[PDB]
Design a protein around this ligand. Structure first.
Ligand SMILES: Nc1ncnc2c1ncn2[C@@H]1O[C@H](COP(=O)(O)OP(=O)(O)NP(=O)(O)O)[C@@H](O)[C@H]1O
Ligand SMILES: [Mg+2]
Length: 324
């Protein structure tokens, strides 16, 4: 068994209506109130548009949802409503359907994002501290609201660098945390999956997001992006073990009584834990500091329980320059 060290019982302390998303009934407005101007994003068969609300001339974003079960739409909508107004959470403005096809769509506030592949190349140490702190505010908020994001990665973090503004987007994988609940391990994107997912441990919690955040921090300070670049979900665990060490992996598995599938033993091999300083070289030295490495070491830990919480991370010395 396992439970979150923070915010474990919050949902049980709230009204059932808060977390019982299957009982939520969205009101679907008419998408003809929205003029779709420009397709946003890099790809992945995405259907996200810059739009203008024709009734008030406000710029928004319309995300047309691919065919999915109503239950998953209700979950995302309810989570977005519960988080509305939270620090650095994207704001859901409306839920609409095209009046002909009846396809549902979500209307969001617009943020003038710069794609991370371009932005991360020009960030300074200070900027990485600043944006990581802003992202932690969003995660502490959602965790405090009983929700795990489950898909933290650069692609889901919108940053307007000129206005120093950040929003955490794409709540389609998010889920309410309930102690002892067994969750689907088919969440997050490969490079950002925590070890718990890769070894099929279902009793995970908010700390999954803190692994993903650590992966982001590592890529930002070291400039190896993604940081753990598995060729498939099995090799993903090997890439982690080559850094954190194999003995430490088997200690984690023992603690939680996790049986590693036997095929893993041959590919895992034997690896000592690496010092994080080993990743420093001339291309990243101006982004790395002892404080950054200490924080990173406290995020990227096999044992999900031992990872820093979002609030603990916000209190780390790495963020002293950006707290005030
Ligand atoms: N509120 C927004 N403002 C500006 N751009 C946005 C906004 N929401 C989404 N985008 C852009 O649309 C892209 C895709 O958004 P996203 O919600 O992640 O779609 P998706 O199809 O679900 N991708 P995935 O992360 O694989 O699930 C983002 O990476 C942005 O480029
Ligand atoms: Mg996304």
């Amino acid at each position: 068994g396992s439970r979150a060290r923070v915010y474990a019982e919050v949902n049980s302390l709230r009204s059932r209506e808060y977390w019982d998303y299957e009982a939520h009934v969205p009101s679907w407005g008419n998408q003809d109130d929205y003029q779709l101007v420009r397709k946003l994003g890099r790809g992945k068969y995405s259907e996200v548009f810059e739009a203008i609300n024709i009734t008030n001339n406000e710029r928004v974003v319309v995300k047309i949802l691919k065919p999915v079960k109503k239950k998953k739409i209700k979950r995302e909508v309810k989570i977005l409503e519960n988080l509305r107004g939270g620090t650095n959470i994207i704001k859901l403005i409306d839920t609409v359907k095209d009046p002909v096809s009846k396809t549902p769509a979500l209307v969001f506030e617009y943020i003038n994002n710069t794609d991370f592949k371009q932005l991360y190349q020009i960030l300074t140490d200070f900027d990485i501290r600043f944006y990581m702190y802003e992202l932690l505010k969003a995660l502490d908020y959602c965790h405090s609201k009983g929700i795990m994001h489950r898909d933290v990665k650069p692609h889901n973090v919108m940053i307007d660098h000129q206005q120093k503004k950040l929003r955490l987007i794409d709540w389609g994988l998010a889920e309410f945390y309930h102690p002892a609940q067994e969750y689907n391990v088919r969440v997050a994107s490969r490079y950002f999956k925590g070890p718990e997912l890769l070894v099929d441990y279902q009793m995970y919690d908010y700390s999954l997001d803190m692994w993903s955040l650590g992966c982001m921090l590592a890529s930002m300070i070291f400039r190896r992006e993604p940081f753990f670049h598995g060729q498939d979900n099995y090799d993903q665990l090997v890439r982690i073990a080559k850094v954190l060490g194999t003995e430490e992996l088997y200690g984690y598995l023992k603690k939680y009584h996790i049986d590693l599938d036997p095929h893993f033993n041959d590919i895992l091999g034997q690896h000592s834990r690496k010092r994080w300083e080993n990743f420093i070289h001339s291309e990243n030295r101006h982004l790395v500091s002892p404080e950054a490495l200490d924080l990173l070491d406290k995020l990227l830990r096999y044992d999900h329980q031992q990872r820093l919480t979002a609030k603990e991370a916000m209190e780390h010395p790495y963020f002293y320059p950006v707290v005030k």
